[PDB]
Amino acid sequence: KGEELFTGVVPILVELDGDVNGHKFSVSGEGEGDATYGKLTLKFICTTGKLPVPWPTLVTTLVQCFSRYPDHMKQHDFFKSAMPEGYVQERTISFKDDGNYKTRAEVKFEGDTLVNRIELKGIDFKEDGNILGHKLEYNYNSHNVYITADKQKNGIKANFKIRHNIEDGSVQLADHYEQNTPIGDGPVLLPDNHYLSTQSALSKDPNEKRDHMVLLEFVTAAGI
Ligand SMILES: [Mg+2]
Numbered sequence: 001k002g003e004e005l006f007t008g009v010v011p012i013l014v015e016l017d018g019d020v021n022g023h024k025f026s027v028s029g030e031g032e033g034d035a036t037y038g039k040l041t042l043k044f045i046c047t048t049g050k051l052p053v054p055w056p057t058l059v060t061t062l063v064q065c066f067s068r069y070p071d072h073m074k075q076h077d078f079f080k081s082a083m084p085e086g087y088v089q090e091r092t093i094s095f096k097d098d099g100n101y102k103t104r105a106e107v108k109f110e111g112d113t114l115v116n117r118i119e120l121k122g123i124d125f126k127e128d129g130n131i132l133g134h135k136l137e138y139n140y141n142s143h144n145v146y147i148t149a150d151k152q153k154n155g156i157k158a159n160f161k162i163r164h165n166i167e168d169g170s171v172q173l174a175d176h177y178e179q180n181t182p183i184g185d186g187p188v189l190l191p192d193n194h195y196l197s198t199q200s201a202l203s204k205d206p207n208e209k210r211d212h213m214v215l216l217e218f219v220t221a222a223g224i
Contacts, residue, residue, distance in 0.1 A: 002083035003074065006035040006065065011113045012042060014062055020122030021099070021132065023052035029062060031215075033114065035080070038068030040217040045210050053122070054136040055213040056164055059200055060093065060176060061103050063116050064145075067196050067219040076191035076224060078147075078156045078180065084109035085184030087155070096173040099125030108183060130164070130172045137165040138202055145196040154188060155181040194223040 014029035031042030044062060065079035086108025093101040105118040125132050145160045158178040163171045182188045196219050203214040
């Protein structure tokens with residue numbers, strides 16, 4: 001079914017257009033995914049200059065179809081079942097004591113490449129907060145993404161809390177509320193409650209002078 005499109009390495013393109021408090025920026029990413037291992041390897045570049053928010057705050061927005069679903073849980077993989085026509089992911093990301101991002105992403109194949117096209121709008125950020133003040137460490141904690149079915153919208157929802165490390169030892173919470181809805185009208189898999197366990201490693205390309213992020217991520221379904 002759509003899962004058949006993910007048995008090997010798949011090239012990935014990510015394109016993001018953003019506006020946070022009137023700071024306009026764009027990000028382009030390239031890399032590949034291998035759902036057999038739940039593995040993503042991507043490099044993202046800010047093509048407009050300096051990124052006006054910290055890179056870690058964009059990780060969740062910057063392809064859950066690459067999650068490794070164990071064989072015994074394959075009937076719960078909504079993301080691949082929506083392919084190749086794709087799905088639309090919408091999120092509200094609420095930064096505790098600060099502003100919010102609202103995002104819309106279309107995830108679909110363009111020929112044999114998996115594309116994630118994103119619009120991000122951020123409002124009500126504090127000039128001197130952890131986000132616009134760039135007070136977040138360049139690292140990333142492991143988290144669970146809790147998925148539930150939304151049968152009346154033929155899709156899924158997700159809820160989860162990201163904890164961003166602040167440079168003083170504290171934590172910036174980012175509450176995520178997510179909806180995913182198929183683009184096509186073929187049948188999709190509507191899962192039982194489960195989660196995705198995600199681990200992410202952020203690094204820099206030593207030969208790259210543009211503002212950028214190298215990401216290695218592993219995503220594995222569990223909870224059934
Ligand atoms: Mg207002």
